[PDB]
Design a protein around this ligand. Structure first.
Ligand SMILES: [Zn+2]
Lengths: 49, 100, 75, 49, 961
DNA sequence: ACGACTGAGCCGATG
RNA sequence: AUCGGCUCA
C-alpha cells in the first residue's frame, strides 16, 4: 500500500520479493565494465540472470 | 549540552534494548548482525527551552527536552558477527558508568 | 527479442532508428494502456516495441501517420 | 553562526536552513520571500548560498 | 518572547478585537481593544491567542483615510512594521506599523483579488473544497461528539454519554461500581459537551494523590489539555494577572485545594464556571444536626455551579443505599426533608423484588395489579388490559413497552446511573488452571529453623514467612539471589514457556525486586523476548513495554508485578495466563485480575497458577477457588469474609502443614458467601440498572458507529491535508505513523515538535497509548487552516478555452462560484448542529450554474498553469470585464440554491426542536427528577434559532477555470 | 621549450 | 576534503 511498507518486506527477506525479481531481470539488461576502457568493447551489455 | 552514553533514545526501543543489557553498553559477547545497536550514544540538538507551563508536563513523564537524537554507535551495514571484549576510557573527572 | 535482434534492425534500416522508432513505441504501450498485437508472451513493454518489427509491423512511417488518427478521434 | 557582515552571512547570502532566519521569528515555509531585517533574511530556500 | 507592541486576537474570544499588548512581568500578557474598549488577560505559554499578520502581495486596512500592501514584513525584535503601499496617490515606500492596524477585519474579499499578482495552485483548491465539504457534512453529522475516544465500543458507557450530552443542565449522580471504569464512561459527556458548544471551564475536584491519572485522561481519553492547580501553580497564577484564575480554562484541583485556606473558597466560586466534576474512593457522610467539615465546602460550590457531575461519593462498598447526601447535592428542590425520602425507599422494595421480569417471577398475583400503580393508579386508561399480560406467545412485546411505564417512572433514576456485572452483559468468563509442584530440600532445611527464631508477640510477622519463600530467602539466609535454578516455578517457566511462545500471556508476581530477578533470568538464561513492567519506572517504559507487549507478535511477554489499579490501557489481546503469587487479600487479588476481566478483553481467559505442596501458598489456592471461587467468578464479597474469618484463618496459615480440622472453613466460607450471592440479587433495584445499561436502545448506538471508524477516505484525506500544509507522512509499517513538521510548510502555532506517534483505528490503537486520528482529534488546528486562512486553495487556474483540448475550443470559459452561508451567531445555542457553513457548485457561462459529473472525477483531468512569470498569470490582464460579466448575473443564482437548504434546515429545526420539546413537556407528567430549567432552555433556544435562521448571508472563497 | 593512467581498498592527519 | 603511506588488476 506504500513505498515504505515495501521497505520492510524487502529488508525482512520475504519470499515474494525474489519472485518479482525474476520477472524484473526478465527483459531488463545490464552494463558490465572493466577498467582500463582502452577502447569501446571495454564496456558491453549482457542480459543477466 | 554534553553527549551521553546510556540507553535513552526517544525512537528505537525497547526493540534493540535487549541486545544491550543495561546502563551503557553491549554486554560482553552479544551476537549482533548488521544494523542493530551496540553502545547507546545520544546528542542534544539545541532548541533549549524554558517556557512556564511546559516544564511540569515534561516533568511528570520521564525526562525528554534538551536532548536527543538517534546518534548511537551502530554495527556497520556489513558482516560483523559478534563481540570479544569492551575497553573503557572514562574521562579523568570520574562520573563513572555502571556497566563500566 | 532476447537473443539477437538482426531481423528487426534492417527492417527500419539501421540500429539508431531501431531506438527512436522503438523508444517511441515502448513509450506508447507503457502510459495509456495501448494494444498488445503480437501475443504478449509474458515479456514487457521493452521487447514489445521491437517485437512488432520482427513480424512485419512497427516503423517510423507508421508512428507519424497514426498519430494523426488520435488527432481525428477527439473532436 | 555566520557573522553579521562576515564572509558567511545570511543578510547577504540567505539563511542557514529552508525559509527560516538566524534570529528566529520566521519558520517552516509560509513567508515566501518575506524581506526580514532583525536577522536580515529575504526568506528564501538557503540554496541561494 | 512576548514583546510590547504586538497584536494578538483570541482563540475562543474573537468577539472583542485585534488586541494590543500592554504588560509583561514574567508569565502573563494584557491586551487592548480600541474598538470595543476593553482588555483580555492571558498567559504567555498556554494562551488562547492567535497571530495576525499578512503575507507578501496582501494588504493592511489602516485607521484614517489611506491603506494598502505590500512589500516586506518588517520585524523589530517582536514588533512588525507593515511598510505598505498607499492607494490614495501612488507612492513607493510607505510605512504603516502593525501597532497601528485596525481592530476590525474587513477582508481581502476573494472577488477583487483577481487584479493583483501570481496565484495559488490547481493542486490544493481541490483539498479546500473537501475541507469546507466535510465541515459542512460532519457538523450536521449524525452523532454529536462521540466519534473518537480511547475506549472500545460498548453500550452502557455510551448510553450515559448519549443521554446527558443532550442535557443542557448536566446534573448526574454517576454511581457504577468498581472495575468497570466509571470515570472514563462517565466523562463520556464532558467531551461531547465541548464540541456542540455550550461549555468551556470545567473545574474538576479531586484529592491531590489522584491527579496524575486524572490529568492524563483528560487528554488521552478525550485529549483534555490540563493545567493543574496546586500551591506550586496557585502562587504562579496569583501574580500572573491577579484576581480569580481566568488564566486557563480546563483545570484540576482538590477540595483539599479549596478547603485548606478559607478565602480560596470565595475565589473558586466567583469564576463563572460551567461544570463541577468530583470523584472519591472514600466517602463524604453527614449525620443530621451535625454536618461534615470538608463537605460544607462544596455546598456553596454546587449551588452557584450550573452543571455538575459526581463520580459517586462512595456507597458501593456498604449500606446499600443511604444516598440522601449525594442527592442533597444535585437538587434541594425535590428533596425538602429526609425524614420523608426513606418512605420512597421503604416502598420500592417489593416492586423490584416483584419485578422479577419474565425470568425469575414469570407470573404474579393481585399484588401486581395493585400498585404499579400508585404511579399509574390515577393516570389510568391503557394498562388495565395490558397489565395482566404475562404469556401466550408474544415474548418480547408487553415487556419492552411496560418497562417505560416504569424506569421512566423511577423518582431517582433520571439522575442516577448504577451499573454492575448482571444488568450489563459484556464480560468474558473465567477458566482457572490448577497446578501442583514438587518441593525442594533447600526450602525444607530452612523453614524448620524459622520456628526456633520464631516466637514474638503481635499478629502479622509470623503469618508472612513460610507462606512466602521466593523473597523469603534474599533477606535472612546468606546469599541474596540464588534461587534461580532451584524451585519449580522456574522449571515450569520453560516447559510451559518453551513451546507456548506463539500466543502472548500475562504474568503477575510478588513485587518489583522479585520480578527484576526473573528478567535477568528468563530474558537471558532461558532466552525469551521479555520486558519489564514494575511500578517504579518512568511513564515511557510503561508505554515501551505495552507497545512492545502489543506488537503483531515480536514482543511476546511482559512480567507484571506489584499492582496497577484498573488501568486505562486495556491489553485487549492478552487472553491467557499464569497466576503467580496468591497474595492474602481479595481486593489486591482482584486487580491482578482487574486488567483481563473487562469487556474489551476479548477471547476467553486462561488462568494458570502453580504451588509447592506443604507451602503457605498450598492452602490459599483452595481457599480462593474451592472456598469462594474468586478465580471462576468475580467476587467483592471475598473481602467481608477475610475480615470475619481473619483470626480464624491466620491460625491455619501460620503453621501451614498441620490441622485437618480446616476444610470446614472452606465450606463455611462456601456457606456465608454462597447465600450472599442471592441476597444481592434481591438487593438489585433492577429498573435503574435497566435504565442505566440500555438494551435495544443502546444496541444501536455502537453498531451504526462501528461503520463510522471504517473510513478509508480519512486515511487518505488527512495525510493529504497536512502533507500539503508542510507536515510529511512517514513510517506506515504500523497502523501509523510518524508525522514530523516539515520545512514545507508551516505556521508556528502547532503543538507537534518532533515525532507524533498515531494511528487511525479504534480497536488496534487500544492496546498501547500514543495518540489517535479521527475527525475530532488534532483537527481544531487543521480545520481552521484549510479554510480560516483563506489564502490556501483560494483562487487557482486550469484547463480553460485552449485550442489544445476538445471538442469546443472557442472560449467557453468556466468559473467556480462557491458561496458560504455563514450562520451569524456563536455556538452556545448550537446553530452549528443544524446549519454550519456550507458549499455549493457553480460553474456558469452567463447562464445558471452547472453540475453533471464529479469534481473528484475531473480533478485529475485538469491542467494548471505550471508557469513562473513571463507566461504565468497571463490571462490576468485582458480578463477583468470578461469573467465579472458573469458576476452581476453570477450573484443572481445564490439566494435560490441557499434559501432552499435554509427552509430545509428550519423544517428540521422546528421539526425536531419542537418535537424533542414534547419529550420534556410530557415527561413532567411522570414527574421523575425534573425542575424548571431544561425546558425553558429549549423554549429560549427555539426562538433564538428561528431567529438564527433568518440572518444568514454569504461569502466567496473559490475559483478554478 | 613543454608534458606526466585507468579503476577503489585501507589507514593517517590538519585547513 | 589536499597531502603522505602502502597492497591487488
Ligand atoms: Zn529575522
Amino acid at each position: 500500500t506504500t513505498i515504505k511498507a515495501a521497505k520492510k518486506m524487502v529488508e525482512r527477506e520475504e519470499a515474494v520479493v525474489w519472485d518479482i525479481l525474476d520477472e524484473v531481470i526478465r527483459e531488463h539488461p545490464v552494463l558490465l565494465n572493466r577498467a582500463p576502457t582502452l577502447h569501446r568493447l571495454g564496456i558491453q551489455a549482457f542480459e543477466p540472470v | 549540552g554534553p553527549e551521553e552514553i546510556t540507553a535513552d533514545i526517544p525512537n528505537v526501543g525497547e526493540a534493540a534494548l535487549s541486545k544491550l543489557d543495561e546502563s551503557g553498553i553491549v554486554y560482553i559477547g552479544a551476537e549482533v548482525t548488521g544494523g542493530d545497536i551496540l553502545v547507546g550514544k545520544v546528542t542534544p540538538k539545541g532548541e533549549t527551552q524554558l517556557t512556564p507551563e511546559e516544564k511540569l508536563l515534561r516533568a511528570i513523564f520521564g525526562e525528554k527536552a534538551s536532548d536527543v537524537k538517534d546518534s548511537s554507535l551502530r554495527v556497520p551495514n556489513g558482516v560483523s558477527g559478534t563481540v570479544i571484549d569492551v575497553q573503557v576510557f572514562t574521562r579523568d573527572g570520574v562520573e563513572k558508568d555502571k556497566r563500566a | 527479442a532476447r537473443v539477437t535482434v538482426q531481423d528487426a534492425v534492417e527492417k527500419i534500416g539501421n540500429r539508431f532508428d531501431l531506438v527512436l522508432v522503438a523508444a517511441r513505441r515502448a513509450r506508447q504501450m507503457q502510459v495509456g494502456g495501448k494494444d498488445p498485437l503480437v501475443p504478449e508472451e509474458n515479456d514487457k513493454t521493452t521487447v514489445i516495441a521491437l517485437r512488432e518489427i520482427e513480424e512485419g509491423l512497427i516503423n517510423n512511417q507508421i508512428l507519424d501517420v497514426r498519430e494523426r488518427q488520435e488527432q481525428q478521434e477527439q473532436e | 553562526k555566520p557573522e553579521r557582515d562576515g564572509l558567511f552571512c545570511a543578510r547577504i547570502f540567505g539563511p542557514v536552513k529552508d525559509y527560516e532566519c538566524l534570529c528566529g521569528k520566521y519558520k517552516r515555509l509560509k513567508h515566501r520571500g518575506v524581506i526580514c531585517e532583525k536577522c536580515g533574511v529575504e526568506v528564501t530556500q538557503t540554496k541561494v548560498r | 518572547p512576548f514583546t510590547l507592541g504586538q497584536r494578538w486576537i483570541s482563540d475562543t474570544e474573537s468577539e472583542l478585537g485585534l488586541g494590543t499588548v500592554v504588560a509583561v512581568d514574567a508569565r502573563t500578557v494584557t491586551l487592548l481593544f480600541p474598538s470595543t474598549g476593553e482588555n483580555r488577560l492571558y498567559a504567555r505559554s498556554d494562551s488562547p491567542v492567535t497571530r495576525v499578520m499578512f503575507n507578501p502581495g496582501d494588504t493592511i486596512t489602516s485607521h484614517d483615510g489611506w491603506q494598502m500592501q505590500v512589500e516586506e514584513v518588517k520585524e523589530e525584535n517582536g514588533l512588525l512594521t507593515y511598510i505598505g503601499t498607499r492607494l490614495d496617490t501612488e507612492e513607493s515606500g510607505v510605512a504603516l506599523r502593525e501597532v497601528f492596524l485596525d481592530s476590525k477585519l474587513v477582508f481581502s474579499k476573494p472577488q477583487d483579488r483577481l487584479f493583483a499578482g501570481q496565484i495559488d495552485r490547481m493542486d490544493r483548491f481541490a483539498l479546500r473544497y473537501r475541507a469546507r465539504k466535510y465541515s459542512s457534512e460532519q457538523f450536521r453529522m449524525p452523532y454529536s461528539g462521540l466519534r473518537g475516544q480511547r475506549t472500545s465500543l460498548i453500550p452502557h458507557q455510551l448510553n450515559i454519554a448519549h443521554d446527558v450530552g443532550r442535557r443542557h443542565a448536566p446534573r448526574v449522580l454517576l454511581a457504577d461500581e468498581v472495575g468497570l471504569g466509571k470515570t472514563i464512561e462517565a466523562g463520556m459527556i464532558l467531551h461531547q459537551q465541548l464540541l456542540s458548544g455550550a461549555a468551556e471551564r470545567v473545574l474538576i475536584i479531586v484529592p491531590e494523590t489522584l491527579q496524575h491519572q486524572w490529568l492524563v485522561e483528560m487528554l488521552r481519553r478525550f485529549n483534555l489539555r490540563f493545567a493543574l492547580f496546586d500551591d506550586e501553580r496557585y502562587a504562579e497564577a496569583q501574580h500572573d494577572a491577579y484576581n480569580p484564575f481566568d488564566t486557563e480554562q480546563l483545570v484540576i484541583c482538590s477540595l483539599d485545594f479549596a478547603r485548606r485556606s478559607k478565602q480560596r473558597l470565595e475565589h473558586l466560586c466567583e469564576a463563572e464556571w460551567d461544570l463541577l466534576v468530583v470523584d472519591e474512593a472514600h466517602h463524604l457522610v453527614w449525620s443530621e444536626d451535625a454536618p461534615s467539615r470538608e463537605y460544607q465546602a462544596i455546598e456553596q460550590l454546587a449551588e452557584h455551579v450550573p452543571g455538575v457531575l459526581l463520580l459517586t461519593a462512595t456507597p458501593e462498598q456498604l449500606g446499600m443505599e443511604s444516598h440522601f447526601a449525594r442527592l442533597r447535592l444535585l437538587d434541594p428542590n425535590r428533596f425538602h426533608d429526609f425524614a420523608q425520602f426513606v418512605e420512597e425507599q421503604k416502598n420500592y422494595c417489593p416492586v423490584a423484588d416483584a419485578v422479577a421480569m419474565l425470568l425469575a417471577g414469570n407470573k404474579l398475583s393481585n399484588d401486581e395489579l395493585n400498585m404499579l400503580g400508585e404511579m399509574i393508579g390515577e393516570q389510568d386508561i391503557e394498562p388495565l388490559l395490558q397489565a395482566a399480560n404475562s404469556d401466550s406467545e408474544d415474548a418480547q412485546s408487553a415487556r419492552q413497552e411496560l418497562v417505560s411505564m416504569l424506569m421512566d417512572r423511577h423518582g431517582t433514576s433520571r439522575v442516577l446511573f448504577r451499573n454492575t456485572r448482571n444488568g450489563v452483559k459484556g464480560f468474558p468468563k473465567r477458566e482457572l488452571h490448577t497446578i501442583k509442584l514438587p518441593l525442594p530440600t533447600q526450602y525444607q532445611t530452612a523453614i524448620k529453623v524459622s520456628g526456633i527464631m520464631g516466637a514474638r508477640k503481635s499478629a502479622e510477622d509470623r503469618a508472612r514467612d513460610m507462606l512466602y519463600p521466593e523473597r523469603i530467602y534474599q533477606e535472612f539466609e546468606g546469599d541474596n539471589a540464588t534461587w534461580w535454578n532451584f524451585d519449580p516455578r522456574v522449571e515450569w517457566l520453560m516447559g510451559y514457556l518453551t513451546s507456548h511462545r506463539s500466543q502472548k500471556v500475562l504474568v503477575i508476581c510478588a513485587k518489583a525486586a522479585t520480578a527484576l530477578q526473573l528478567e535477568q533470568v528468563l530474558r537471558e538464561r532461558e532466552g525469551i523476548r521479555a520486558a519489564v513492567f514494575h511500578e517504579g519506572m518512568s511513564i515511557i517504559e510503561r508505554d515501551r513495554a505495552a507497545a512492545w507487549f502489543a506488537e503483531e507478535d515480536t514482543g511476546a511477554q511482559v512480567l507484571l508485578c506489584s499492582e496497577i489499579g484498573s488501568e486505562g490501557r486495556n491489553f485487549q489481546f492478552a487472553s491467557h495466563m499464569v497466576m503467580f503469587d496468591l497474595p492474602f487479600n481479595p481486593d489486591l487479588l482482584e486487580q491482578r485480575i482487574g486488567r483481563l476481566d473487562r469487556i474489551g478483553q476479548a477471547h476467553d481467559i486462561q488462568i494458570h497458577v502453580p504451588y509447592l505442596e506443604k507451602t503457605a501458598q498450598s492452602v490459599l489456592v483452595r481457599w480462593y477457588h474451592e472456598g469462594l471461587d474468586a478465580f471462576e467468578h468475580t467476587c467483592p464479597t471475598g473481602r467481608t469474609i477475610y475480615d470475619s474469618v481473619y483470626n480464624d484463618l491466620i491460625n491455619y496459615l501460620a503453621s501451614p502443614d498441620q490441622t485437618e480440622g480446616f476444610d470446614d472453613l472452606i465450606k463455611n466460607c462456601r456457606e456465608q458467601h454462597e447465600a450472599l450471592k442471592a441476597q444481592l440479587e434481591q438487593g438489585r433495584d433492577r429498573l435503574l440498572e435497566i435504565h442505566s445499561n440500555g438494551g435495544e436502545k443502546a444496541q444501536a448506538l455502537a453498531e451504526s458507529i462501528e461503520e463510522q471508524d471504517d473510513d478509508t477516505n480519512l486515511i487518505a484525506f488527512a495525510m493529504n491535508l497536512f502533507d500539503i500544509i508542510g507536515i510529511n507522512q512517514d513510517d506506515r509499517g504500523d497502523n501509523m505513523i510518524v508525522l514530523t513538521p516539515s520545512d514545507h510548510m508551516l505556521v508556528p502555532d502547532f503543538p507537534g515538535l518532533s515525532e507524533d506517534g498515531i494511528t487511525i483505528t479504534f480497536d488496534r490503537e487500544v492496546a498501547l497509548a500514543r495518540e489517535d486520528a479521527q475527525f475530532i482529534t488534532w483537527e481544531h488546528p487543521l480545520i481552521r487552516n484549510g479554510l480560516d486562512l483563506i489564502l490556501s486553495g483560494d483562487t487557482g487556474s486550469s484547463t480553460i478555452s485552449l485550442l489544445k483540448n476538445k471538442a469546443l475550443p472557442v472560449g467557453t470559459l468556466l468559473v467556480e462560484l462557491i458561496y458560504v452561508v455563514e450562520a451569524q451567531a456563536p455556538k452556545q445555542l448550537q446553530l452549528n448542529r443544524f446549519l454550519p457553513p456550507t458549499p455549493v457548485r457553480m460553474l456558469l457561462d452567463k447562464n445558471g450554474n452547472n453540475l453533471a459529473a464529479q469534481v473528484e472525477f475531473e480533478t485529475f483531468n485538469r491542467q494548471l498553469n505550471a508557469v513562473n512569470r513571463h507566461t504565468g498569470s497571463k490571462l490576468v490582464n485582458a480578463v477583468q470585464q470578461d469573467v465579472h460579466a458573469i458576476l452581476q448575473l453570477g450573484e443572481a443564482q445564490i439566494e435560490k440554491s441557499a434559501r432552499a437548504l435554509i427552509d430545509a434546515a428550519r423544517n428540521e429545526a422546528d421539526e425536531k426542536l419542537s418535537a424533542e420539546l414534547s419529550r420534556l413537556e410530557a415527561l413532567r407528567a411522570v414527574n421523575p427528577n425534573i425542575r424548571d430549567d431544561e425546558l425553558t432552555a429549549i423554549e429560549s433556544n427555539r426562538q433564538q434559532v428561528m431567529e438564527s435562521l433568518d440572518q444568514a448571508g454569504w461569502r466567496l472563497d473559490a475559483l478554478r477555470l
